[PDB]
Amino acid sequence: HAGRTGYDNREIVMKYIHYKLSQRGYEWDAGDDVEENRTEAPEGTESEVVHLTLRQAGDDFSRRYRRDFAEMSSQLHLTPFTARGRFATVVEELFRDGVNWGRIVAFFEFGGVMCVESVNREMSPLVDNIALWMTEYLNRHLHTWIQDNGGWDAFVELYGPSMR
Numbered sequence: 001h002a003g004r005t006g007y008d009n010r011e012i013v014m015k016y017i018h019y020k021l022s023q024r025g026y027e028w029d030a031g032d033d034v035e036e037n038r039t040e041a042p043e044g045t046e047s048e049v050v051h052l053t054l055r056q057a058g059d060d061f062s063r064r065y066r067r068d069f070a071e072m073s074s075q076l077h078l079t080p081f082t083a084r085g086r087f088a089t090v091v092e093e094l095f096r097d098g099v100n101w102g103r104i105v106a107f108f109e110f111g112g113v114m115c116v117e118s119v120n121r122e123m124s125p126l127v128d129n130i131a132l133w134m135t136e137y138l139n140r141h142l143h144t145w146i147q148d149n150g151g152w153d154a155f156v157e158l159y160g161p162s163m164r
């Protein structure tokens with residue numbers, strides 16, 4: 001028993017980060033497996049309603065906070081070795097006491113800022129590694145808080161767009 005959508009932290013971050021990159025027009029090679037994979041068709045109105053909420057809400061939050069996540073980015077510095085180790089330290093502080101919708105969204109936005117940081121210099125591919133770590137930690141901590149407290153749909157119900 002577990003819904004019938006097929007939610008996946010990996011796919012959620014992939015879609016979110018994708019739009020973040022598309023904004024600039026950088027064809028992110030996320031789906032290296034471009035062999036037309038139409039298993040059960042792309043149609044997924046189920047998890048679709050949640051995607052728009054997370055992607056739209058996430059960006060909405062970051063927009064409300066001009067100086068916080070970006071300002072700190074300067075400390076993150078650029079490097080493929082420390083990048084991985086520096087990422088955890090950032091998400092670790094986000095959820096130090098307890099998790100919440102507002103916190104989840106925050107981390108989500110943070111990951112994108114970092115994934116793009118690499119592209120700023122010359123590490124677009126790094127965007128893939130970022131989404132990977134985000135899915136590990138997200139599910140390592142959030143998935144438990146989200147699933148235990150309803151699930152992905154729980155948030156969409158709370159932040160149900162005007163009518164739709």
Ligand SMILES: CC1(C)CCN(c2ccc(C(=O)NS(=O)(=O)c3ccc(NC(C)(C)CSc4ccccc4)c([N+](=O)[O-])c3)cc2)CC1
Nearest residue numbers: 057058060061064065068069100101102103105106155159
């Ligand atoms: C960069 C930071 C250091 C990250 C952590 N921060 C937070 C900021 C705001 C919240 C927060 O608002 N929590 S909430 O639980 O009170 C909430 C408020 C609003 C909304 N959704 C809107 C209004 C639809 C879009 S605007 C938005 C989205 C998420 C967070 C903040 C603003 C949701 N939600 O999507 O579930 C949840 C939590 C942490 C402070 C800045």
